[PDB]
Design a protein around this ligand. Structure first.
Ligand SMILES: O=C(O)CNC(=O)C(=O)O
Ligand SMILES: [Mn+2]
Length: 235
């Protein structure tokens, strides 16, 4: 089953049919006019952010043993992990780039739907997710609502309800208890047999689209192209 797509639903419709019951949806016609949609290119990103230091995750998946985190400039990240035939997967993941670079904040907008939350606009966390084709964020859940906005490229996204948590075999450790032990796209069904029958939603999220990921919904994300997404974590 595919995540439903709705064009600019009213605040009330979003609240009653999606936010309150905790059901995912893709919102169209909302972020398609961010300036970012037309302005953000590798060249623009280099011009505005190239000299700044960013954290970069190196390795296929953050659950891997060889996975690590390092620091480099945005120019270095683009050169080593996007443009030149990269040797390893690098991902500028989960970074508050817009607090670091306020000029880029002018190219985005917080969706009006976030004002249905009980939290302060000031406390919404805005993260950049910028990387090559093939980045993977393993199946995990977050403690706030999320609007994940796709700017450049496409992502394949799989969503499992919190009701299905048993079939997802969360890690026992404290660092990883919000992360599944299962590789979604190649699950070990001898070790994790309950995963096979667990229902899910999926989508390909394209530029200009917003995915609403309800609080605690399990999500898995693979970039299909050079990709730039912006998430808003809110309550
Ligand atoms: O985009 C990705 O790779 C992963 N995104 C998230 O987990 C998020 O926005 O919370
Ligand atoms: Mn997440």
């Amino acid at each position: 089953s595919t995540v439903p797509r709705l064009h600019r639903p009213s605040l009330q419709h979003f609240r009653e049919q999606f936010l309150v019951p905790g059901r995912p949806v893709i919102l169209k016609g909302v972020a398609d006019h961010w300036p970012a949609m037309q302005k953000w290119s590798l060249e623009y990103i280099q011009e505005i952010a190239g000299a700044r230091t960013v954290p970069v995750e190196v390795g296929s998946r953050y659950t891997d043993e060889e996975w690590s985190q390092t620091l480099m400039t945005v120019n270095e990240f683009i050169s080593k992990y996007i443009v030149n035939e990269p040797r390893d997967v690098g991902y500028l993941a989960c970074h508050q780039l817009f607090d670091q670079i306020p000029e880029l904040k002018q190219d985005i907008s917080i969706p009006d739907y976030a004002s249905l939350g009980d939290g302060e606009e000031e406390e919404i966390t805005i993260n950049a997710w910028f990387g090559p084709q093939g980045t993977i964020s393993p199946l995990h859940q977050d403690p706030q609502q999320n609007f994940l906005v796709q700017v450049m490229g496409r992502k394949y996204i799989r969503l499992y309800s919190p009701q299905e948590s048993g079939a997802l075999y969360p890690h026992d450790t404290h660092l990883l208890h919000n992360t599944s032990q299962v590789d979604v796209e190649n699950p070990d069904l001898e070790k994790f047999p309950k995963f096979a029958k667990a229902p899910f939603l999926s989508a390909i999220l394209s530029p200009g689209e917003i995915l609403f990921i309800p609080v605690k919904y399990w999500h898995y994300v693979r970039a299909l192209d050079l990709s730039f997404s912006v998430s808003f974590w809110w309550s």
